[PDB]
Amino acid sequence: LVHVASVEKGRSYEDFQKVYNAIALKLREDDEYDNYIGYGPVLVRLAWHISGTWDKHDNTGGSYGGTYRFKKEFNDPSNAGLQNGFKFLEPIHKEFPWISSGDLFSLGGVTAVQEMQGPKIPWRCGRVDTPEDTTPDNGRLPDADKDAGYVRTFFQRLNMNDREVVALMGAHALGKTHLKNSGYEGGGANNVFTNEFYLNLLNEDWKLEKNDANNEQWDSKSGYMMLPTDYSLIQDPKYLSIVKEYANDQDKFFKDFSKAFEKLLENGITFPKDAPSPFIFKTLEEQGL
Ligand code: HEM
Ligand SMILES: CCOC(=O)c1cnc2ccccc2c1N
């Protein structure tokens, strides 16, 4: 099973920058969403979920196929709430129908991260829409009620190591949990990409409680929350070290996240030797737009 990247015919950097810009402009002007969080966080989550289906053992799933457009994956309980990201991207796709679904979904996550003042995420095109019988079964994305051993084992399926895992989890500084979506409630409702996930883990006084859906979560007096899988990053000594490193080094966190997030979005894709170099898109701000 090889998924070879194939550049959308006749497209170049500028074409993709235009799609980036459309997403970013819509992020700016659809700012009311989810009590003024905006769509940034959910678009980051969508990019991660469409990528997180990958299995290194047989090379199935991941972003290449754009199979989130299909009913089985669209309706995965693990993807509850992602329909909002899909709806956001739908007019974007109609404006730029030449882009593959997987390129669009992954590009939305890149754009969201950069537009929320995150690190630049290099991004490669060439994901190709594959048929419905390539859609991965439900159950490939991770549960939140688990411990560090689970997180570590889970992520080995996506060929991620401890540093990559800890880096990627910093995305949980963004957005919030929604009881109706996941059985968890709360979060900072933040839309600026920072290293505050790690600072919060280390600095808050956390109490493990049951929530209204009778799930376990960690709550702070200041009103932040952490999933059991989030908190496992300070229970495990290897993860804790890296948590401390990112809490104390914003630039290192940015750089490591950029690498891990790109890798996440590219898992399962074979890039031929004559493929274009990754693109680094300019923000609206850098374009004076
Ligand atoms: C152990 C792995 C992970 C687990 C168990 C997990 C679990 C969760 C849960 C339960 C939610 C709340 C969803 C809702 O209630 O709407 C959430 C939200 C979120 N997750 Fe994760 N996550 C994991 C890893 C990741 C990764 C690797 C990223 C991206 C790099 C990511 C990005 C996000 C973002 C941005 C949100 C907020 C979305 C919003 O505000 O709508 N997560 N996650
Ligand atoms: C502000 C950083 O710490 C948090 O408040 C926090 C912790 N875990 C989360 C897990 C999922 C979504 C949001 C999350 C979140 N916002």
Torsion of CA 21, 89, 253, 142, to 10 degrees: -170
Instruction: Compute the C-alpha angle 159/105/153, nearest 5°.
Output: 20
Query: Are 158 and 56 spatial neighbours (Cβ–Cβ below 8 Å)?
Result: yes
Residue 49 among known ligand-binding residues = no
How far CA 252 is from CA of 123, 171, 239, 249, in Å, comes to 19, 15, 15, 5
203: its two tokens: 């600095």
Rg, C-alpha atoms of the chain: 18
Is 124 annotated to bind a ligand? Reply is no
Stretch(es) of the chain classified as CATH 1.10.420.10: 142-260
Q: Whose CA is nearest to atom 13 of ligand 1?
A: 177
Nearest to 240 by CA among 250, 231, 249, 229: 231
CATH architecture of 142-260: Orthogonal Bundle (1.10)
* Residue 280 tokens, joined: 């680094």
Report d(CA 74, CA 86) in Å as an integer. 9
Check if the beta carbon of residue 109 is closer than 8 Å to that of residue 265. Answer: yes
| CA separation for the pair 102, 268 (Å, rounded) | 12
Among the residues of the chain, which ranges form H helices? 13-29, 33-36, 40-51, 71-74, 83-95, 101-115, 148-156, 162-169, 179-182, 196-203, 228-235, 237-247, 250-266, 284-287
Contacts of 156 (CB under 8 A, 6+ apart): none
Cα angle 67, 70, 75 (rounded to 5 degrees) comes to 110
Question: Are the C-beta atoms of 283 and 110 separated by less than 8 Å?
Answer: no
Instruction: Determine the Cα–Cα distance for residues 221 and 227; give it in Å rounded to an integer.
Output: 16
Across the strands, what pairs with 226?
Answer: 218
Q: Is 168 in the pocket of ligand 1 (CB under 6 A)?
A: yes
CA of 176 from ligand 2 middle (Å) equals 6
For 1, 5, 198, 209, 240, the CA distances from 230, given in Å and listed in that order, are 33, 33, 10, 14, 11
177 CB less than 6 Å from ligand 1?
yes
Other CB atoms closer than 10 Å to residue 215's CB: what's the count? 18
Cα distance between residue 124 and residue 269, in whole Å: 10
Question: What's the count of helices (H) and strands (E) in the chain, helices before strands?
Answer: 14, 7
Question: Which residues lie closer than 8 Å to 131 by C-beta, 6 or more apart?
Answer: none
Q: Is 172 in the pocket of ligand 1 (CB under 6 A)?
A: yes
- Residue 135, classed as helix, strand or coil, is coil
Nearest to 41, CA basis, from 79, 73, 82, 94: 82
Alpha carbon nearest to ligand 2 atom 7, residue = 226
Domain 1-141+261-289 in CATH 3.40.190.80? The answer is no
Mutate to test the pocket of ligand 2, among 184, 224, 234 (most ligand atoms within 8 A of CB): 224
Q: Determination technique for this PDB entry?
A: X-ray
DSSP letter at 56? T
- Closest ligand 1 atom to 81 CA: 16
Query: Taking a C-beta distance cutoff of 8 angstroms, is the pair 4, 64 a contact?
Result: no
The sign of the dihedral angle between the CA atoms of 42, 51, 143, 147 is negative
Distance of CA 162 to the CA centre of its chain: 17
52 Cβ contact partners less than 8 Å away, ≥ 6 residues apart: 140, 141, 142, 158, 264
Asked whether the beta carbons of 20 and 11 are under 8 A apart, the reply is no
CA of 200 to the centre of ligand 2 (A): 9
- Outline which parts of the chain fall under CATH 1.10.520.10: 1-141+261-289
The 3-state DSSP composition of the chain as helix, strand, coil percent (nearest 5) reads 50, 10, 40
Compute, in angstroms, the gap from residue 170 CA to the centroid of ligand 2. 9
Angle between helices 250-266 and 101-115 (to 10 degrees): 170
Q: Which residue has the tokens 């080094």?
A: 249
Q: How far apart are alpha carbons 154 and 1 in whole angstroms?
A: 22
Q: Which ligand neighbours the alpha carbon of 37 most closely?
A: 1
Q: Count Cβ atoms below 10 Å from residue 18 Cβ, excluding itself.
A: 13
In the sheet with 206-210, reading across from the earlier edge strand, the strands are: 206-210, 216-220, 225-226
The reply to whether 161 sits in an annotated binding site is no
DSSP-derived 3-state class of residue 188:
strand
Tell me if 265 sits within 8 A of 106, measured CB to CB. yes
Closest residue (by CA) to atom 15 of ligand 2? 187
93 is in an annotated binding site: no
Distance 172 CA to ligand 1 centre (A): 6
Cβ neighbours of residue 133 under 8 Å, at least 6 residues apart?
Answer: none
Tell me whether residue 181 is annotated as binding.
Answer: yes
- Tell me how long the chain is: 289
Question: Integer distance in angstroms from the first to the last C-alpha of the chain?
Answer: 42
